[PDB]
Amino acid sequence: GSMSAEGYQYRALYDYKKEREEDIDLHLGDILTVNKGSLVALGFSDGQEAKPEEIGWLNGYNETTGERGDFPGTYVEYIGRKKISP
């Protein structure tokens, strides 16, 4: 209805394979989505949500594969956000 994303999004940069049961399979064009106003999803309290370069592990889900797990903040690229960061 709002005609917008249901949280913050990221875009995969390179194909990564999962080596841990805690991680999931990552491919190209695969966009990840997180929460919208509960950054405590990660236990974070900065409010940055834009420079994965310093962020360690991000937890989200890949709608394309309906999968859910954790991924590093170096193989993806922050792209889009809700109005929580003017």
Swiss-Prot record:
Q: Where is the SH3 domain?
A: 5-81
N-acetylserine: modified positions: 4
Its post-translational modification remark reads: Polyubiquitinated in T-cells by CBLB; which does not promote proteasomal degradation but impairs association with CD28 and CD3Z upon T-cell activation.
Q: Which domain of life is it from?
A: Eukaryota
Q: How does it assemble?
A: Heterodimer of a regulatory subunit PIK3R1 and a p110 catalytic subunit (PIK3CA, PIK3CB or PIK3CD). Interacts (via SH2 domains) with CCDC88A/GIV (tyrosine-phosphorylated form); the interaction enables recruitment of PIK3R1 to the EGFR receptor, enhancing PI3K activity and cell migration. Interacts with PIK3R2; the interaction is dissociated in an insulin-dependent manner. Interacts with XBP1; the interaction is direct and induces translocation of XBP1 into the nucleus in a ER stress- and/or insulin-dependent but PI3K-independent manner.
Tell me which family the UniProt entry assigns to this protein: Belongs to the PI3K p85 subunit family.
- What's this chain's function? Binds to activated (phosphorylated) protein-Tyr kinases, through its SH2 domain, and acts as an adapter, mediating the association of the p110 catalytic unit to the plasma membrane. Necessary for the insulin-stimulated increase in glucose uptake and glycogen synthesis in insulin-sensitive tissues. Plays an important role in signaling in response to FGFR1, FGFR2, FGFR3, FGFR4, KITLG/SCF, KIT, PDGFRA and PDGFRB. Likewise, plays a role in ITGB2 signaling.
The domain section of the record reads: The SH3 domain mediates the binding to CBLB.
Q: What is this protein called?
A: Phosphatidylinositol 3-kinase regulatory subunit alpha
- Placed within the complete protein, the shown segment runs 1 to 84 of 724
